[PDB]
Amino acid sequence: MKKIAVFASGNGSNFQVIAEEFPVEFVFSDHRDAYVLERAKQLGVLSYAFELKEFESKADYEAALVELLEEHQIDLVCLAGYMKIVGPTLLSAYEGRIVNIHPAYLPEFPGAHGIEDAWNAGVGQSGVTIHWVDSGVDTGQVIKQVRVPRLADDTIDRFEARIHEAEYRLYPEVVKALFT
Ligand SMILES: [Cl-]
Ligand SMILES: [Cl-]
Ligand SMILES: [Cl-]
Incomplete structure (x- = not known):
């Protein structure tokens, strides 16, 4: 059985859903004041946190992440609201082992x-996408996609809440197939 780690930069609403249906080794946040740390404390989930300001470069920042992942024998890294680009340092260690929701x-x-981009465009339907992470920005192989409608x-x-609810139901389903 795979050991799962979660990266969350903000509220960590997706982490809440994952941790309730899947055993989470630990959860990382690039913000020491993110609310995702509060959830982890309530769910009894291990939580690490350090910011980019505390490092000389992004390479050293991701080096601390790799060491942290290797220490817990992480087999899969779930990006649940991680608002930071995955650099080559982290990609070189966990290529094809990092999933992300969008x-x-x-x-x-x-x-x-x-x-906001989809709401300002005026498109009738948006959606939720879960995919793998490569070198490009949101250009990885799509694992699961669903359409989310826009009302009058x-x-x-209201629109943002509908997307997030779609994320809460899609993420555990996708992980469930990849977990084993
Ligand atoms: Cl979230
Ligand atoms: Cl999101
Ligand atoms: Cl994203």
Whole structure:
């Protein structure tokens, strides 16, 4: 059985869902004040945290990540709200072992704010994409994709909530197939 690690930069809502249905070795955050650390404390999940400011370069930053992953014998790294590009240091160690979820029907609206990009565009449907991570930005092999509709009386809050709910149901399903 694979040992799973989770990277979350913010609220860590996806981490909450994963940790409830899958045993998580530990969860990392690039923000020492992220709320995902609070959830880990409540779920009894090990949690590490260090910022980019504490390193000379991004290479040294990702070097600490690799050492941390290798120490816990991590077999799969789930990016659940990790708002940072995966550099070559981390890719060289965990190529084809890193999955990521994206609040957009790739390759439509890639980036950090795929929700706002799709909402400002006026497209009738967005989606949720779970894929592998390579050198490119959101250009990995797609594992699972679903469409998320846009309503008439939809605010940016109502629309964002529909995407996140789609993420909470899709992520455990995809991991369930990859976990074993
Ligand atoms: Cl999240
Ligand atoms: Cl997200
Ligand atoms: Cl993303």
